[PDB]
Design a protein around this nucleic acid. Structure first.
Ligand code: ZN
Ligand code: ZN
Ligand code: ZN
Ligand code: ZN
Lengths: 200, 200, 200, 200
DNA sequence: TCACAAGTTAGAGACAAGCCT
DNA sequence: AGGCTTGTCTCTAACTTGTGA
């Protein structure tokens, strides 16, 4: 089904200079998660760990939160809620925390919350923002994507964006960034292909 | 049956500098939607996505709406209401929102409204106007045309115009633009043919 | 919709030596009705006169009737009732005698009856059998076919057979014959094409 | 889930000399249904017409029925009930007669019955046996397969057999035959590949 | 990773079949 | 009846994208 609205995807570094960072990987055919700076696009395998770094120029207040939400990238599909396909929603691979219909999970965080928006029908996953750990310069969140982009009855080969928002305790916007995502069996192969096709 | 009047088709950019834009496609025999600047004519396949861009020089007020209506292009046919043919009206391919007789649908918009004008008998489809992200420069609406121009008992090979009007909440005119439409099996082939014939 | 059964099409000359005959026409591109002995197939234009000759070796009893019924030729379509398309059913071209949904009409016979079979849902048209007018060797019935084979939502390019049955006053079978029919804009052209393709 | 038993697949021509026949098709990459005598295997596209001929040496009694049932061909999978995948079960493409979970449908038969066996949990589809006329030599049933062999969460790339049984009015066995089935996007390509691999 | 399985898209070309000067 | 309009089919080939020894 459809949402009545479309979440904004405009980059907004905001008062805290909020930026995203990604690990440097290359393109071994079967690498588990790899980011293309050229495409601003993450290529990852289903259910595998996807590190996303949060960088700020100055620390936001205690109670700040970090939300992730997927939307379809193509305008004609933007109003359709991104969710898991009928098969994966039924295979019971929940980690005890995530509802079965949610595409994006956060792993390794007991304070994770999953939201099914009463008004927009959009799914999202939120964790408290924690400043960087000793001497590290950034905060890392580990996401999992629970369907392939290709999943019939779900994303069905349509590209998505992940929107990461920094919010205050009330849900007010503090910052926003986004990246494209392809969940696929062969992230290395597929990243290479799409990068090659930039010239075509 | 016939309407008592004919909707105006005169271009009117109005106070907000309202213009239309179209995606740049070429003419692969079986492309789904392609626009000819030379003919100001959209060539599209039945039920396929047809993106139309709304450009304004300045943002209209909240509550502004965008209406689409088809009329026959030829003067002798202008008073005839454009509607779906008897076969397609009966094939039940409604998206739950559009009445079966309406030629033009909007896809991916929960706030769509379909009007069967009590006085003029004309069909139209309207959605709220939404300003672009302050990143994008225009707003895109996705239309679907639900019969071929050739449909016997419907358009019956007669060309139509789509009239796009920008209206206030009361239905008062703020701006108007229009383009010719051919719904056909082979948009690319047909666009090429008609453009070639410009010289003939 | 579908019938629960399929009418038999087996030739049965029966006790009266019942055979069909057709006029000798050739293949002028736009001839109105032409019969191919090679294909046992009539090619005719929509609503035009199609003469069919009834030949018998001996005269059946007074009260004998002649029924015509169409069925789809292809096995997968045989259970589907042959009827007019949605457009032609609605165009009101009835001769005051034929129901609008019936494909086959008889012209020039005040004693024609149209049957919509309560059990099989099949349409048919029946007239009283009349022996040949003094000196002629056969009885001619003039049929009209009220859709093209190509009509979308009706025959939809599927070939049909016309089954002609000689019946007693109770509807018991006395004899049966059949021929394929194509209703088309250009019977002469199309007959020639199908005959040429016999070698291919 | 699993059945407690496995339907027999042993060929049994029985008292009436029950045999199957198939149409002669070749291997155009995108043909809709093609049978390989070498593999005794039908290759067909999802939801497309699959003609199966029933041949008998003598006519079974009125009330005889013809049942079709799918089972997995591989022994380790044989106890698993063959059914549609979660996606296709939910896409609502029912013809008003078939339950959404059934893989095999019969098209064009108003007397079709769909059985969900209370004890074995197996799905099957059955129609009354109808003799040919004394013109045709066989009776044809038109099946549709409503998932690809590859469907994730359903057949999941596992080959199936279709078992066709001739039964009396009580369900007692009169005859049995079977053939392998692959439902796939490119029956011609795939048939050619598997036939070539017979030598490998 | 490679080799292969198996679905989807885009051409092109050849036709199919209505229209009307 | 020619010539053209306009929908449909085959076709092949490239490509997409998952699987597994
Ligand atoms: Zn999935
Ligand atoms: Zn139509
Ligand atoms: Zn018709
Ligand atoms: Zn399926």
């Amino acid at each position: 089904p459809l949402s009545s609205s479309v979440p904004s995807q405009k980059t907004y570094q905001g008062s805290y200079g909020f930026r995203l960072g990604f690990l440097h990987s290359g393109t071994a055919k079967s690498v588990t998660c790899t980011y293309s700076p050229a495409l601003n696009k993450m290529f990852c395998q289903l259910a595998k760990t996807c590190p996303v770094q949060l960088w700020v120029d100055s620390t936001p207040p205690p109670g700040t939160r970090v939300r992730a939400m997927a939307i379809y990238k193509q305008s004609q599909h933007m109003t359709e809620v991104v969710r898991r396909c009928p098969h994966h929603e039924r295979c019971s691979d929940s980690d005890g925390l995530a509802p079965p219909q949610h595409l994006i999970r956060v792993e390794g965080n007991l304070r994770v919350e999953y939201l099914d928006d009463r008004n927009t029908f959009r799914h999202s996953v939120v964790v408290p923002y924690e400043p960087p750990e000793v001497g590290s310069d950034c905060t890392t969140i580990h996401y999992n994507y629970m369907c392939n982009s290709s999943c019939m009855g779900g994303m069905n080969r349509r590209p998505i964006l992940t929107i990461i928002t920094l919010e205050d305790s009330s849900g007010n916007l503090l910052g926003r960034n986004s990246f494209e995502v392809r969940v696929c069996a062969c992230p290395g192969r597929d990243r290479r292909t799409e990068e090659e096709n930039l010239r075509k």
